[PDB]
Coordinates of C-alpha atoms and ligand atoms in Angstrom, one line a residue:
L27 CA -1.2 18.8 -12.0
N28 CA 1.5 16.3 -9.8
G29 CA -0.5 13.6 -8.3
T30 CA -0.3 12.5 -5.1
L31 CA -1.6 9.3 -2.9
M32 CA -1.9 8.8 1.0
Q33 CA -2.0 5.9 2.9
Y34 CA -5.1 7.2 5.0
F35 CA -4.2 4.7 7.9
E36 CA -1.7 3.0 10.3
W37 CA -2.4 -0.2 12.1
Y38 CA -2.2 1.5 15.7
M39 CA -5.0 3.6 15.6
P40 CA -7.7 3.6 18.3
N41 CA -11.1 1.3 17.7
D42 CA -13.5 4.4 18.7
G43 CA -15.4 4.0 14.9
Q44 CA -14.4 7.8 14.0
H45 CA -12.1 7.5 11.4
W46 CA -14.5 7.9 8.4
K47 CA -15.8 10.5 10.0
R48 CA -12.0 12.1 10.6
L49 CA -11.5 11.4 7.3
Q50 CA -14.6 13.1 6.3
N51 CA -12.9 16.0 8.3
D52 CA -9.7 16.2 6.8
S53 CA -10.5 16.3 3.2
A54 CA -9.7 20.0 3.0
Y55 CA -6.6 19.9 4.8
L56 CA -5.7 17.1 2.0
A57 CA -7.3 18.8 -0.9
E58 CA -5.2 22.2 -0.1
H59 CA -1.8 20.3 0.3
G60 CA -2.1 18.6 -3.1
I61 CA -3.5 14.7 -1.9
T62 CA -5.1 13.6 -5.0
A63 CA -6.0 10.2 -3.9
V64 CA -6.7 8.4 -0.9
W65 CA -5.9 4.6 -0.2
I66 CA -8.7 3.6 2.7
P67 CA -8.2 0.3 5.0
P68 CA -10.1 -2.5 4.3
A69 CA -13.8 -1.1 4.6
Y70 CA -15.6 -4.4 5.4
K71 CA -16.2 -6.2 8.2
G72 CA -13.6 -8.3 10.2
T73 CA -13.1 -10.8 12.6
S74 CA -14.0 -8.8 15.2
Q75 CA -15.0 -5.0 15.5
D76 CA -10.7 -3.9 16.3
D77 CA -9.5 -5.9 13.1
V78 CA -7.3 -3.6 11.2
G79 CA -9.5 -4.9 8.1
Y80 CA -7.4 -7.9 6.7
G81 CA -9.6 -10.9 8.7
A82 CA -12.1 -10.6 5.4
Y83 CA -14.9 -11.9 7.5
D84 CA -17.9 -10.7 5.3
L85 CA -16.6 -8.6 1.9
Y86 CA -20.5 -7.5 1.7
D87 CA -20.9 -5.9 5.2
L88 CA -19.6 -2.8 4.8
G89 CA -20.1 -1.7 8.6
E90 CA -23.5 -2.4 7.8
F91 CA -24.7 -5.9 9.8
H92 CA -24.5 -6.7 13.4
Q93 CA -21.7 -9.4 13.2
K94 CA -18.8 -10.4 15.2
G95 CA -19.9 -8.2 18.1
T96 CA -20.8 -5.0 16.3
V97 CA -22.3 -3.0 12.8
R98 CA -19.4 -0.9 12.7
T99 CA -16.1 -1.8 11.2
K100 CA -13.5 -0.6 13.2
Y101 CA -13.4 2.6 11.6
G102 CA -17.3 3.4 11.3
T103 CA -20.1 2.5 9.2
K104 CA -21.0 2.3 5.6
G105 CA -23.2 5.4 5.7
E106 CA -20.0 7.5 7.3
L107 CA -17.5 5.8 4.5
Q108 CA -20.1 7.0 2.1
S109 CA -20.1 10.7 3.5
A110 CA -16.4 10.6 4.0
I111 CA -16.1 9.5 0.0
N112 CA -18.5 12.4 -1.0
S113 CA -16.7 15.1 0.6
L114 CA -13.4 13.7 -0.6
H115 CA -14.9 13.5 -4.3
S116 CA -16.7 17.2 -3.8
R117 CA -12.4 18.3 -3.5
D118 CA -11.4 16.2 -6.5
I119 CA -9.5 13.1 -4.3
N120 CA -9.9 10.0 -5.8
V121 CA -10.4 7.1 -3.6
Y122 CA -8.8 3.6 -3.6
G123 CA -10.2 0.5 -2.1
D124 CA -8.2 -2.0 -0.3
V125 CA -9.0 -5.5 -1.6
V126 CA -8.6 -8.6 0.8
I127 CA -9.7 -11.8 -1.1
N128 CA -6.6 -14.1 -0.1
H129 CA -8.2 -15.9 2.6
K130 CA -11.5 -15.2 4.6
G131 CA -11.2 -15.1 8.5
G132 CA -13.4 -15.5 11.4
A133 CA -16.0 -18.5 10.2
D134 CA -19.2 -18.7 12.1
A135 CA -19.0 -22.5 12.1
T136 CA -16.0 -25.4 11.5
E137 CA -16.7 -28.1 8.9
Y138 CA -14.9 -31.8 9.7
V139 CA -12.5 -31.7 6.6
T140 CA -10.3 -34.5 5.3
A141 CA -6.7 -32.9 4.9
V142 CA -2.9 -33.3 5.0
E143 CA 0.0 -31.4 6.8
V144 CA 2.1 -29.7 4.2
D145 CA 5.7 -28.5 5.1
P146 CA 5.5 -24.9 6.0
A147 CA 9.3 -24.4 4.4
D148 CA 7.9 -26.0 1.1
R149 CA 4.2 -26.1 0.9
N150 CA 4.6 -28.7 -2.1
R151 CA 5.8 -31.3 0.3
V152 CA 3.5 -33.3 2.1
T153 CA 4.0 -34.1 6.1
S154 CA 1.3 -36.6 6.9
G155 CA -1.3 -38.9 5.9
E156 CA -4.8 -38.2 5.2
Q157 CA -6.5 -37.1 8.9
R158 CA -10.0 -35.6 9.5
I159 CA -9.5 -31.9 11.2
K160 CA -11.9 -29.5 12.4
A161 CA -11.3 -25.7 10.1
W162 CA -12.9 -23.1 10.4
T163 CA -14.6 -22.9 6.9
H164 CA -18.5 -22.2 7.2
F165 CA -19.8 -18.6 6.3
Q166 CA -23.3 -18.0 6.7
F167 CA -23.6 -14.7 7.1
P168 CA -26.2 -14.5 9.8
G169 CA -26.4 -10.6 10.5
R170 CA -26.5 -10.3 7.1
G171 CA -28.4 -13.1 5.7
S172 CA -28.6 -12.8 1.5
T173 CA -28.9 -9.1 1.7
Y174 CA -26.7 -8.0 -1.3
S175 CA -25.4 -11.8 -2.1
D176 CA -26.7 -15.2 -1.2
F177 CA -23.1 -16.6 -1.7
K178 CA -22.4 -18.9 0.9
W179 CA -18.5 -20.4 1.6
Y180 CA -17.7 -24.0 2.6
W181 CA -14.5 -25.4 3.3
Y182 CA -14.7 -26.6 -0.5
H183 CA -14.2 -22.8 -1.7
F184 CA -10.9 -23.1 0.2
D185 CA -6.9 -24.9 -0.6
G186 CA -6.4 -24.7 3.2
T187 CA -6.3 -23.4 6.5
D188 CA -3.9 -23.2 9.6
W189 CA -5.9 -24.3 12.1
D190 CA -7.5 -27.5 13.6
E191 CA -10.1 -26.8 16.1
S192 CA -10.1 -30.7 17.4
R193 CA -6.7 -30.5 18.7
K194 CA -6.2 -27.4 18.9
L195 CA -3.2 -27.2 16.4
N196 CA -1.5 -24.8 14.3
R197 CA -0.2 -26.5 11.5
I198 CA -0.5 -25.6 7.6
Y199 CA -3.2 -27.8 6.4
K200 CA -4.3 -28.8 2.6
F201 CA -7.7 -30.3 2.1
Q202 CA -8.6 -33.3 0.2
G203 CA -9.0 -32.9 -3.9
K204 CA -7.2 -29.3 -3.3
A205 CA -3.8 -28.3 -4.8
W206 CA -2.3 -24.9 -3.8
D207 CA -2.9 -22.3 -6.7
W208 CA 0.0 -21.5 -9.7
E209 CA 1.1 -19.0 -10.5
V210 CA 2.1 -17.9 -7.0
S211 CA 5.2 -16.6 -5.2
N212 CA 7.5 -19.6 -4.8
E213 CA 9.0 -18.7 -1.7
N214 CA 8.3 -21.6 0.6
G215 CA 7.7 -23.4 -2.5
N216 CA 4.8 -22.3 -3.2
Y217 CA 3.5 -19.6 -0.8
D218 CA -0.6 -19.8 -1.9
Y219 CA -1.4 -20.2 1.9
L220 CA -0.5 -17.6 4.1
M221 CA -3.3 -17.2 6.5
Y222 CA -6.8 -18.1 7.8
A223 CA -9.0 -20.4 5.4
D224 CA -7.1 -20.1 2.2
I225 CA -9.0 -19.1 -1.0
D226 CA -9.0 -21.3 -3.9
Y227 CA -8.9 -19.9 -7.4
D228 CA -9.4 -22.8 -9.3
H229 CA -12.6 -23.1 -8.2
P230 CA -15.0 -21.4 -10.9
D231 CA -17.9 -20.2 -8.6
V232 CA -15.2 -18.3 -6.6
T233 CA -13.5 -16.7 -9.3
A234 CA -17.1 -15.8 -10.4
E235 CA -17.9 -14.4 -7.2
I236 CA -15.2 -12.9 -6.2
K237 CA -15.3 -10.4 -9.4
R238 CA -19.4 -10.1 -8.7
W239 CA -17.9 -8.8 -5.3
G240 CA -15.7 -6.4 -7.0
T241 CA -18.3 -4.7 -9.2
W242 CA -20.7 -4.3 -6.0
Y243 CA -17.7 -3.1 -3.8
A244 CA -16.7 -0.2 -6.8
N245 CA -20.3 0.2 -6.9
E246 CA -21.7 0.7 -3.1
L247 CA -18.7 2.8 -2.7
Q248 CA -18.1 5.2 -5.8
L249 CA -14.6 4.1 -6.1
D250 CA -12.1 5.1 -7.9
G251 CA -9.7 2.5 -8.1
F252 CA -8.1 -0.3 -5.9
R253 CA -5.4 -1.2 -3.7
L254 CA -4.8 -5.4 -3.6
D255 CA -4.0 -7.1 -0.6
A256 CA -1.2 -9.7 -0.2
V257 CA -1.0 -10.7 -4.1
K258 CA 2.2 -12.5 -4.1
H259 CA -0.2 -15.1 -2.0
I260 CA -2.9 -14.6 -5.0
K261 CA -2.9 -17.0 -8.3
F262 CA -1.8 -13.8 -10.7
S263 CA -4.2 -14.9 -13.8
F264 CA -7.0 -14.5 -11.7
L265 CA -5.8 -11.1 -10.3
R266 CA -5.4 -9.5 -13.9
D267 CA -8.8 -11.1 -15.0
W268 CA -10.6 -9.5 -12.1
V269 CA -8.9 -5.9 -12.8
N270 CA -9.9 -6.2 -16.3
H271 CA -13.5 -7.8 -15.3
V272 CA -14.2 -5.0 -12.7
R273 CA -13.1 -2.2 -15.4
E274 CA -15.2 -3.3 -17.4
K275 CA -18.7 -4.1 -15.4
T276 CA -17.9 -0.3 -14.2
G277 CA -16.7 1.2 -17.3
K278 CA -13.7 3.1 -15.6
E279 CA -10.0 3.4 -15.5
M280 CA -9.9 2.2 -11.5
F281 CA -6.2 2.6 -10.8
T282 CA -5.0 -0.6 -9.3
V283 CA -1.7 -0.9 -7.5
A284 CA -0.7 -4.3 -5.7
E285 CA 1.1 -4.9 -2.9
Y286 CA 3.4 -7.7 -3.9
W287 CA 6.2 -7.9 -1.1
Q288 CA 9.3 -8.8 -1.9
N289 CA 12.6 -6.8 -1.7
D290 CA 13.3 -8.1 -5.5
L291 CA 13.0 -6.0 -8.5
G292 CA 13.0 -9.5 -10.8
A293 CA 10.0 -11.1 -8.4
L294 CA 8.3 -7.8 -8.9
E295 CA 8.8 -7.5 -12.6
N296 CA 7.8 -11.0 -13.4
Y297 CA 4.6 -10.4 -11.5
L298 CA 4.0 -7.5 -13.5
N299 CA 4.7 -9.6 -16.5
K300 CA 2.1 -12.3 -15.7
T301 CA -0.6 -9.5 -14.8
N302 CA 0.3 -7.7 -18.4
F303 CA 1.3 -4.4 -16.8
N304 CA -2.2 -3.6 -16.4
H305 CA -2.0 -2.4 -12.9
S306 CA 0.8 -0.7 -10.9
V307 CA 2.9 -2.1 -7.7
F308 CA 4.4 -0.4 -4.3
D309 CA 8.4 -0.3 -4.8
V310 CA 9.4 -2.1 -1.8
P311 CA 12.7 -2.2 -3.1
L312 CA 13.1 1.6 -2.8
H313 CA 11.4 1.3 0.7
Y314 CA 14.2 -1.0 2.1
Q315 CA 16.9 1.4 0.3
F316 CA 15.3 4.3 2.6
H317 CA 15.5 1.9 5.5
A318 CA 19.0 0.8 4.5
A319 CA 20.3 4.4 4.1
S320 CA 18.4 5.8 7.7
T321 CA 20.4 2.7 9.7
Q322 CA 23.7 2.7 8.4
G323 CA 25.1 6.1 9.6
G324 CA 26.4 8.0 6.5
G325 CA 28.0 4.5 5.3
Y326 CA 25.1 4.3 2.9
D327 CA 26.0 4.8 -1.2
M328 CA 23.7 7.1 -1.8
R329 CA 23.9 6.5 -5.3
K330 CA 22.5 3.3 -4.6
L331 CA 19.0 5.2 -4.8
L332 CA 18.9 5.5 -8.5
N333 CA 18.9 1.5 -9.1
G334 CA 17.2 -1.7 -8.3
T335 CA 13.8 -0.1 -7.5
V336 CA 10.4 -0.5 -9.4
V337 CA 10.4 3.5 -10.3
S338 CA 14.1 3.0 -12.2
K339 CA 12.8 0.5 -14.4
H340 CA 8.9 1.1 -14.5
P341 CA 7.6 4.6 -13.7
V342 CA 4.3 4.5 -14.9
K343 CA 3.7 1.2 -12.5
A344 CA 5.8 2.3 -9.4
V345 CA 3.7 3.2 -6.4
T346 CA 6.5 4.5 -4.6
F347 CA 6.8 5.0 -0.7
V348 CA 8.7 5.4 2.3
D349 CA 6.6 3.6 4.9
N350 CA 3.2 1.9 5.5
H351 CA 1.4 -0.7 8.1
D352 CA 3.3 -3.6 7.4
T353 CA 6.8 -1.8 7.8
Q354 CA 5.8 0.6 10.9
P355 CA 7.1 -0.5 14.1
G356 CA 5.9 -3.6 15.7
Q357 CA 4.7 -5.0 13.0
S358 CA 5.2 -7.7 10.8
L359 CA 7.3 -6.6 8.0
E360 CA 9.1 -4.1 10.4
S361 CA 11.6 -1.7 8.5
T362 CA 11.2 1.5 9.5
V363 CA 12.7 4.3 8.1
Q364 CA 14.4 6.0 10.6
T365 CA 13.4 9.4 11.8
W366 CA 15.7 11.6 11.1
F367 CA 16.2 10.4 7.4
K368 CA 12.2 10.2 6.7
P369 CA 12.1 13.8 5.4
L370 CA 14.6 12.9 2.7
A371 CA 13.0 9.9 1.3
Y372 CA 10.1 11.9 1.3
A373 CA 11.5 14.3 -1.1
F374 CA 12.9 11.3 -3.5
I375 CA 9.7 10.1 -3.9
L376 CA 7.8 13.9 -3.8
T377 CA 10.2 15.9 -6.0
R378 CA 11.5 13.5 -8.5
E379 CA 10.0 13.2 -12.1
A380 CA 9.0 9.3 -12.1
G381 CA 6.6 7.4 -10.0
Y382 CA 3.7 8.0 -8.1
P383 CA 4.2 8.7 -4.7
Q384 CA 2.3 7.9 -1.6
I385 CA 2.4 9.7 1.9
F386 CA 1.9 7.5 5.0
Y387 CA -0.8 8.5 7.6
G388 CA 1.2 7.5 10.3
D389 CA 4.1 9.4 9.4
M390 CA 2.3 12.6 9.2
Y391 CA -0.1 12.5 12.1
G392 CA 2.3 9.7 13.8
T393 CA 1.7 6.2 14.9
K394 CA -0.2 5.1 18.4
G395 CA 1.3 1.7 19.0
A396 CA 2.0 0.7 22.6
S397 CA 5.7 1.4 22.0
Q398 CA 8.5 4.1 22.9
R399 CA 9.7 3.7 19.3
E400 CA 6.4 4.9 17.4
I401 CA 7.1 6.8 14.5
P402 CA 6.4 11.0 15.6
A403 CA 3.8 12.9 13.7
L404 CA 5.9 14.5 10.9
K405 CA 3.0 16.9 9.2
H406 CA 5.4 19.6 9.6
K407 CA 8.6 18.4 8.3
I408 CA 6.5 16.9 5.4
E409 CA 4.2 20.0 4.0
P410 CA 7.1 21.6 2.9
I411 CA 8.0 18.9 0.7
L412 CA 4.3 18.1 -0.3
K413 CA 4.1 21.8 -1.3
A414 CA 7.3 21.3 -3.6
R415 CA 5.5 18.9 -5.3
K416 CA 2.7 20.5 -5.6
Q417 CA 3.3 24.2 -7.2
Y418 CA 7.2 23.3 -7.9
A419 CA 8.1 19.6 -8.9
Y420 CA 7.4 20.1 -12.7
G421 CA 9.7 19.9 -15.9
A422 CA 12.9 18.6 -16.9
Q423 CA 14.8 16.5 -14.6
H424 CA 19.1 16.8 -13.7
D425 CA 20.4 14.2 -11.9
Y426 CA 23.3 14.9 -9.4
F427 CA 24.4 10.9 -7.8
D428 CA 27.8 12.0 -7.9
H429 CA 28.8 11.7 -4.2
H430 CA 28.6 8.9 -1.6
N431 CA 26.7 11.3 1.0
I432 CA 25.6 14.3 -1.2
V433 CA 23.3 13.4 -4.1
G434 CA 20.5 15.8 -5.8
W435 CA 18.4 16.5 -8.4
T436 CA 16.7 19.4 -10.1
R437 CA 13.7 20.5 -11.9
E438 CA 13.9 23.1 -14.6
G439 CA 10.0 24.6 -14.4
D440 CA 7.3 24.3 -17.0
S441 CA 5.4 27.2 -18.3
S442 CA 2.2 25.6 -17.7
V443 CA 2.7 26.0 -13.8
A444 CA 3.9 29.7 -12.8
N445 CA 7.5 29.8 -10.9
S446 CA 7.6 26.0 -11.1
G447 CA 11.4 24.8 -10.6
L448 CA 13.4 23.3 -7.8
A449 CA 16.6 22.4 -6.7
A450 CA 16.7 19.3 -4.6
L451 CA 19.9 18.3 -1.8
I452 CA 19.7 15.5 0.5
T453 CA 22.4 13.7 2.7
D454 CA 23.0 10.6 4.8
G455 CA 26.0 12.1 6.3
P456 CA 28.0 15.7 6.1
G457 CA 26.0 18.9 4.7
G458 CA 28.0 21.0 2.2
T459 CA 27.2 22.5 -1.4
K460 CA 27.0 21.3 -5.1
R461 CA 26.4 23.4 -7.8
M462 CA 23.0 22.3 -10.0
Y463 CA 21.9 23.4 -13.2
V464 CA 18.2 24.5 -13.2
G465 CA 17.5 26.2 -16.2
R466 CA 19.0 29.2 -18.3
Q467 CA 15.3 30.2 -18.6
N468 CA 15.4 30.6 -14.5
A469 CA 18.7 32.6 -14.8
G470 CA 18.8 35.8 -12.2
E471 CA 15.7 34.2 -10.1
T472 CA 16.4 34.1 -6.7
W473 CA 15.5 30.6 -5.0
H474 CA 14.9 30.1 -1.4
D475 CA 14.8 26.7 1.1
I476 CA 11.1 25.7 1.2
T477 CA 11.9 23.6 4.1
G478 CA 13.3 26.4 5.9
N479 CA 16.5 24.2 7.0
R480 CA 19.0 26.6 5.2
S481 CA 18.0 30.7 5.6
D482 CA 20.6 31.3 2.7
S483 CA 18.9 32.8 -0.8
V484 CA 20.5 31.4 -3.8
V485 CA 20.9 33.7 -7.3
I486 CA 20.9 31.4 -10.1
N487 CA 23.7 32.2 -13.0
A488 CA 23.3 33.7 -16.5
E489 CA 24.3 29.9 -17.4
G490 CA 21.2 28.4 -15.5
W491 CA 23.3 27.1 -12.4
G492 CA 23.3 27.8 -8.7
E493 CA 25.1 27.0 -5.9
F494 CA 23.3 24.9 -3.3
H495 CA 23.3 23.9 0.5
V496 CA 22.6 21.5 2.7
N497 CA 23.0 20.6 6.3
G498 CA 24.1 17.4 8.0
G499 CA 21.7 14.8 7.2
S500 CA 19.4 17.1 6.3
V501 CA 17.2 18.0 3.2
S502 CA 17.0 21.2 1.4
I503 CA 14.6 22.0 -1.8
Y504 CA 15.3 25.4 -3.0
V505 CA 12.3 27.1 -5.2
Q506 CA 11.6 30.7 -6.8
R507 CA 11.1 33.4 -3.6
Ligands
CA605 CA1 -3.6 -17.5 -1.7
CA606 CA1 -6.1 -24.4 -5.3
NA607 NA1 -5.7 -20.6 -2.7
NA608 NA1 26.4 8.1 2.7

């Protein structure tokens, strides 16, 4: 009954075109270990074969047309992806497609465009007179032609770009007659501009087309939902309308989670309010608390984990996570949760009652960057925690955040899941004990640490309490033998 998401990629995976086939082959393992949905990387053609997918050259080329030096995307062909989805669906695993609609990269040709420079620290401030630039804005899709969509893109579908090809210069340019979209993040004055050619969501043909593409994408891949990329750079009312639109056209629930990247609960709450709470967000503040705890050597106050997070205020709209493709080593938002702490963080997201937790491919299987700081494969340490969630993390919760280091929580179990109930402890410093209440209904049961970190049994007393142990900088999750 508990649902668990997996982000099924990391940044540095090899460009061998076998990822979709790998996903197909992993479907039995995923289903067996309690994964109920996967977020797949962007499935459409990027600026090159080795694009992770955020380039977003051609949204209608799912590895089907010979464009940018390749038919396949990094991850494989359309047919291979459709087969992977078919295998996942046969095991009741839902699939969330990544939606990259902030920008378009890798335009087929430049156009001459009149523009002004803007201050990268305050994009509302103009820093030049008008000048003629060569911007990468013409999309003709020569390998695809009009198959699926005859929509062509031109400079006037965008607000701006970061590159003038004529002078060969990297600045933020705003096109003549354009205005940055609102509402977006107010960072850098207005954070509409991020990268490549920035889509103009004031343009009514653009809003219609991105909506029409959304339905097409959902149909083509039989998606159950979406992950929205870079949403702090995209007109909030448009994202609301897009989600409603696709739900209306498909007639499906289409669970959606947006990546609004800001370590700030208030900003996230503003985004939720302005999108009418129609979709979830990733719990970025919780990720930064995990990173903080993992880097402070026991000095972190573990009590802080209960506050300042999306999951603490809006649990039904929080997708909780430990690390992702932006926070992994070497990447643009690097804030990796250190390996020693990582299982403790997974206990926090997987065994507590609030939030929709997500497991990271890079944590399960390791990351394949070129550094000596890559995340090691932690599958074996995460699996017992996944099993705790799947089989034991049910029923009423009791919190014990009553200590700088050793914090814990229990779950009483639910009569709908036989033998359910658990008692979790984590500590960023010295180990020790904590007595916790697991429910009088569990009186006299013998519980053991499903992680194997502690080998002692705990017998629950008549009053429903057990004396639970945890090792230094460790995690233990006791459940009925
Ligand atoms: Ca934008
Ligand atoms: Ca605009
Ligand atoms: Na824009
Ligand atoms: Na601490």
